[PDB]
Design an enzyme around this catalytic site. Structure first.
Site, short mmCIF file in Angstrom:
data_model
loop_
_atom_site.label_atom_id
_atom_site.label_comp_id
_atom_site.label_asym_id
_atom_site.label_seq_id
_atom_site.Cartn_x
_atom_site.Cartn_y
_atom_site.Cartn_z
N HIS A 137 -1.92 -11.43 2.35
CA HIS A 137 -0.77 -10.16 1.77
C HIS A 137 0.60 -11.47 1.97
O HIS A 137 1.35 -10.87 1.38
CB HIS A 137 -1.13 -9.11 2.10
CG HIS A 137 -2.21 -8.28 1.73
ND1 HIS A 137 -2.13 -7.85 0.51
CD2 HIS A 137 -3.31 -8.01 2.47
CE1 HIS A 137 -3.36 -7.25 0.62
NE2 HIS A 137 -3.84 -7.09 1.50
N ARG A 150 -9.46 -14.77 2.31
CA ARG A 150 -10.74 -15.55 1.76
C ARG A 150 -10.25 -16.93 1.21
O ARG A 150 -9.37 -17.84 2.02
CB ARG A 150 -9.62 -14.70 -0.25
CG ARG A 150 -10.73 -12.78 -0.35
CD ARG A 150 -10.23 -13.21 -1.83
NE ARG A 150 -10.41 -11.29 -1.93
CZ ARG A 150 -11.73 -11.42 -2.51
NH1 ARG A 150 -12.51 -11.62 -3.46
NH2 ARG A 150 -11.73 -9.02 -2.99
N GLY A 157 -11.06 -9.07 6.82
CA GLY A 157 -10.72 -8.40 5.91
C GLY A 157 -9.75 -8.92 4.40
O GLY A 157 -9.54 -8.40 4.03
N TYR A 160 -16.09 -6.52 1.01
CA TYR A 160 -16.00 -4.45 0.25
C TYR A 160 -17.67 -5.07 -0.61
O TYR A 160 -17.35 -5.53 -1.37
CB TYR A 160 -14.72 -5.43 -0.37
CG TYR A 160 -14.14 -5.58 0.22
CD1 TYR A 160 -13.25 -6.70 0.59
CD2 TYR A 160 -13.05 -4.01 0.76
CE1 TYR A 160 -12.44 -7.03 1.57
CE2 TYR A 160 -11.91 -4.43 1.75
CZ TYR A 160 -11.37 -5.87 2.17
OH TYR A 160 -11.08 -5.97 2.72
N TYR A 180 1.17 -0.88 0.34
CA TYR A 180 0.01 0.02 -0.21
C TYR A 180 1.06 1.23 0.29
O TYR A 180 -0.16 2.34 0.31
CB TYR A 180 -0.79 0.26 1.26
CG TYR A 180 -2.13 -1.29 1.59
CD1 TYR A 180 -1.43 -2.37 1.28
CD2 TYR A 180 -3.24 -1.22 1.00
CE1 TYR A 180 -2.57 -3.54 1.47
CE2 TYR A 180 -3.64 -1.64 0.83
CZ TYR A 180 -3.49 -3.09 1.43
OH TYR A 180 -4.66 -4.31 1.40
C1 LIG Z 1 -7.60 -5.76 2.95
S1 LIG Z 1 -6.47 -3.88 3.61
C2 LIG Z 1 -7.04 -4.51 5.18
C3 LIG Z 1 -8.48 -3.25 5.50
C4 LIG Z 1 -9.52 -3.49 6.52
N1 LIG Z 1 -8.94 -5.08 7.29
C5 LIG Z 1 -10.78 -3.48 5.95
O1 LIG Z 1 -11.59 -4.30 6.75
O2 LIG Z 1 -11.54 -2.76 5.24
C6 LIG Z 1 -5.39 -5.38 4.53
C7 LIG Z 1 -4.04 -4.76 5.70
O3 LIG Z 1 -2.67 -5.47 5.72
C8 LIG Z 1 -1.80 -4.87 6.33
N2 LIG Z 1 -0.55 -5.49 6.14
C9 LIG Z 1 -0.16 -6.44 5.34
N3 LIG Z 1 1.05 -6.69 5.56
C10 LIG Z 1 1.09 -6.28 6.73
C11 LIG Z 1 1.98 -6.91 7.98
N4 LIG Z 1 3.30 -7.72 8.09
N5 LIG Z 1 1.66 -6.17 9.61
C12 LIG Z 1 1.03 -5.41 9.57
N6 LIG Z 1 0.07 -4.79 8.90
C13 LIG Z 1 0.33 -5.47 7.39
C14 LIG Z 1 -2.07 -3.84 5.36
O4 LIG Z 1 -1.30 -2.64 6.12
C15 LIG Z 1 -3.14 -3.95 4.63
O5 LIG Z 1 -3.66 -2.26 5.50
#
Ligand SMILES: C[S@@+](CC[C@H](N)C(=O)[O-])C[C@H]1O[C@@H](n2cnc3c(N)ncnc32)[C@H](O)[C@@H]1O
Ligand SMILES: C[S@@+](CC[C@H](N)C(=O)[O-])C[C@H]1O[C@@H](n2cnc3c(N)ncnc32)[C@H](O)[C@@H]1O
Ligand SMILES: C[S@@+](CC[C@H](N)C(=O)[O-])C[C@H]1O[C@@H](n2cnc3c(N)ncnc32)[C@H](O)[C@@H]1O
Ligand SMILES: C[S@@+](CC[C@H](N)C(=O)[O-])C[C@H]1O[C@@H](n2cnc3c(N)ncnc32)[C@H](O)[C@@H]1O
Lengths: 292, 292, 292, 292
Positions: free
Chosen positions: C142, C175, C137, C194, C21
């Site tokens: 990720h 997912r 979410g 979403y 992001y």
């Molecule tokens: C799909 S988004 C979340 C959206 C929100 N939870 C919602 O329900 O709308 C996934 C989030 O995972 C976080 N993320 C990814 N890798 C991460 C990590 N290693 N440590 C902390 N946060 C992480 C990102 O910053 C991102 O905002």
């Protein structure tokens, strides 16, 4: 330009919003770069406050917010300030500070938003305008002259000036590049804006394109307290690039930004400046007072 | 028990094989950049040939082959030449030429291979060595000083010198950087090595790091014949970077490459050169004769 | 009898802090992607709140804060929540929200800080721990498996679990990749997390390396309200990458994170889930209750 | 508000050619990848020569020249061949070979030039055309479907076909992707076109976008003889990308390239091919005979 341009577009897109602080390293250690914000602010605090007051200024817009150094001071001194900056990495810290003192009525009314000189007019609705605008810390010099002509410079300088309510003030500064260009090296330590023993080194880099100074790049080395047990010290390294604005040129540029409807003056390091004077300032503070 | 032994460090820039001609654009229009190869070669042809003959030279190694300009001439003049170059994009054209005149006994026996000054010793088995070695056209200046010290320069210059049979010759040149650095700008058109009306512009770019000239970057603009119907001309743009070797330094460097076992001399633009002389040469041709 | 060696256990150079992001485009339009946060939160609000309450949870840590969607709800519902996230571009909005409602006692005590699952243990001093931890979410997916082995997955899952006070809860989802991998395409619109008519398209991209699903890349197309007068609509495009965690594997992975000292269960889309069931969930919510 | 459909399609993706062999590593070791060119050519040599002769072919154009493998054979066999290729890094070796045997009348008349299927029509003036055209070694699969539609494929296939004199032949092949896509993995070693014990590994990588096979990326590991004293072997690593053409589709595509004025047939590995047959070919050789 010959003929007429009907189909410009751009088949190649290399550069794009180049936020020099996007990487975030400069921000992470800015505090370390500045040193004692109080010690720093100690200088020129009297002058800035005196000047602001002398002209009955209450609404102040800080276009180079950064981490909040000078915005914070103005807030504490009872001014109504709103601070903008293009780097959300820097603002991130000013915000952090505001939240921390969110219980102080003064800070509750502190406004911090993102904005870019190039599009200030649309980013910050000046409307009536501000009593004073400040661009301290050699921030404007960051703007590059990519377009070949100082167009960007002119536009940004225009937008910024456009935020000054008539009879208002504009305090914009820049490093003494008339000296850097001459010596190839930037002054060592003991800076009025950045006075920290943590900054171990600042390597200059002058790039003159076809015999004309085009850019000055500084490579900083700031020791992050600790970063290793006794015997092994750790540092942080980042680079920033500036357009070397020669005094005379900026004076002309900034003045033009006001369409000549202003009163211009410049101080060395917040002290009177007369060319040929013994003391060689590290910065040049331009004070402009819009009249029409 | 410390450890083993190393040569390189963990901080210097090892780069990534940086063939400035890898992109291929410079090669594609080199012919356009040089102009009339015959007109070019006309100058210094007499001198080069004269010098080669005066020292009974038959075996000639061209370490800056390029498109073959001077290798071809030497071939036509009955010399036994072998040409090397690091850019297969440039060599590609010399090869093309050789094949075209493959029916000329002279050219059959023309040797063209890839090689790099930095590893010449292993790329071109000199064995007995060559009677003469040539590095014309401001080719050596391409070598950067990334390692901090002119180590690369010293190594390359050593390897090249190592190809000169005792009593042999080495003709290596470089642009007059004592002037470029002084004026910021490179001389305009009318060059002895590159004389083409197709070259519309050459923008310099001097980069001095910590007050020391570190690199000169030239940005060429060569009009490619045609590139648009009447009313719209088309051009080609490429950039090349050189280490600005000041005369005095190169004299010292190159001489050292022979371990002092040589006879050194330098000409302006293939004419005698005396410091302070009216005529300002665009290139400096170093003539070295190995003795031991 | 004493040794030497080196380092570098990996083969490639990898990326380097790869915040998906960081570009900021996904954040800028996340609101548009989610749609009506209230409508979204409507579902599973009852369940989440019910579950939290049933286990007497007051201290809640949100490791996937994002823009604050679920942290905000928990705050409003009287919980004591602290939210962390690795993307300062996303957090930036949660912060913005908190400040806006800074006058609500609830939000005054809302904690928002940056942190990374990989280093959670040091980023968020759990100390005693939290009553509940949430990762909703499809955020965990990720995390990539660059190291070859799900080591990173194991470490992160461990750190996250380490924040759950004994008897505490952990609600982590992902997912339904068992379906995505099977159909190559991700479900179209109408998502519980979403649900926005602004999202015009989501193109999947499954990358199986040597016959093993390695990564699923989704390319979103969200229409930015307006972005052009009538007749010309404008959109925003961003891409996100996830590791396709098959249900069975995650169940095993997450359970292992608790050293088996837990109570595991999983729901379809916050509804009971039985394999072979007609309804195909878009997400899989894992509910874990630490016991020791 | 002028015209949405001007010429074709305004793409804002890129504008660079992507020569997968530009890096040069694949070329440097192609020989190692192929193995014994003689052993390789041994297979299908009889068939190719027989087919060429059976149709009275003398003028042969090789659009996938590469290092010259099959062009060389045809030259030796008394054919009048002209070879083209887009990679000057590959051609560089065929050229090298031709020069080496420049004394053989046959090779003297061997034509080698650069060209691209996409612009073949203008690169190689077919004029009357050639008696036969060959595209062996899974070369065409390199062409990507970036434009969304197999337009590029269609254009290239058209140009290539356009070089076949009426009554002439076209031998174009491709890997058996119907199998690779099915198993995710490419067949291990023992290849008819590449049979070298030097190739230690070939890692596949199937990328299906929105459930449709979009690209197959192979990562090769070829041991460069030596590359380290006894106890330490050295290898070379490179990657190539192909569009996974399913048999049925290619048959349709290639046939269409001839506007249906042709006679199509396909062999397994130069052996008759009947679907469902035990033997699973590694390549599919398409033989087309233009009729009108
Ligand atoms: C799909 S988004 C979340 C959206 C929100 N939870 C919602 O329900 O709308 C996934 C989030 O995972 C976080 N993320 C990814 N890798 C991460 C990590 N290693 N440590 C902390 N946060 C992480 C990102 O910053 C991102 O905002
Ligand atoms: C040297 S820093 C300021 C430090 C701070 N003023 C101090 O005194 O510590 C320069 C600032 O200029 C800002 N800046 C650069 N270009 C800008 C632009 N086009 N619009 C707005 N801010 C810009 C950056 O975000 C950066 O924080
Ligand atoms: C200015 S060009 C020569 C043009 C040609 N000599 C002429 O007079 O037209 C410089 C050449 O230096 C060669 N070169 C640069 N670095 C090299 C290296 N390390 N080893 C060998 N050749 C090198 C390039 O391939 C390039 O063709
Ligand atoms: C696998 S290699 C051929 C190897 C050789 N045919 C053999 O059998 O060893 C594929 C060749 O396709 C060529 N190629 C790829 N795209 C091309 C294009 N658009 N036009 C012309 N040649 C192309 C490359 O230059 C590359 O050498």
């Amino acid at each position: 330009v010959d003929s007429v341009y009907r189909t410009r577009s751009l088949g190649v897109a290399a550069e794009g919003i180049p936020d020099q602080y996007a990487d975030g390293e400069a921000a992470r250690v800015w505090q370390l770069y500045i040193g004692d914000t109080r010690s720093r602010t100690a200088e020129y605090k009297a002058w800035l406050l005196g000047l602001l007051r002398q002209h009955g200024c209450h609404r102040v817009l800080d276009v180079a917010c950064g981490t909040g150094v000078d915005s914070i001071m103005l807030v504490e001194e009872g001014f109504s300030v709103t601070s903008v900056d293009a780097s959300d990495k820097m603002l991130k810290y000013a915000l952090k500070e505001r939240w921390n003192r969110r219980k102080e009525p003064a800070f509750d009314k502190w406004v911090i938003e993102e904005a870019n000189w190039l599009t200030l007019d649309k980013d910050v609705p000046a409307g009536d305008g501000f009593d004073a605008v400040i661009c301290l810390g050699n921030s404007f010099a960051h703007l590059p002259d990519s377009k070949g002509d100082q167009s960007e410079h002119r536009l940004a300088l225009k937008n910024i000036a456009s935020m000054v309510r008539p009879g208002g003030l504009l305090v914009i500064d820049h490093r003494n590049y008339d000296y850097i260009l001459s010596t190839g090296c930037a002054p060592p330590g003991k800076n009025i804006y950045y006075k920290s023993d943590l900054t171990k080194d600042i390597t200059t880099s002058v790039l003159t394109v076809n015999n004309k100074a085009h850019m000055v790049t500084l490579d900083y080395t700031v020791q992050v307290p600790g970063a290793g047990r006794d015997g092994a010290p750790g540092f942080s390294k980042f680079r920033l690039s500036y357009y070397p604005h020669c005094l005379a040129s900026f004076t002309e540029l900034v003045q033009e930004a006001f369409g000549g409807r202003c009163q211009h003056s410049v101080l060395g390091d917040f002290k009177p400046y007369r060319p040929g004077q013994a003391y060689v300032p590290c910065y040049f503070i331009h004070v402009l007072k819009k009249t029409g």
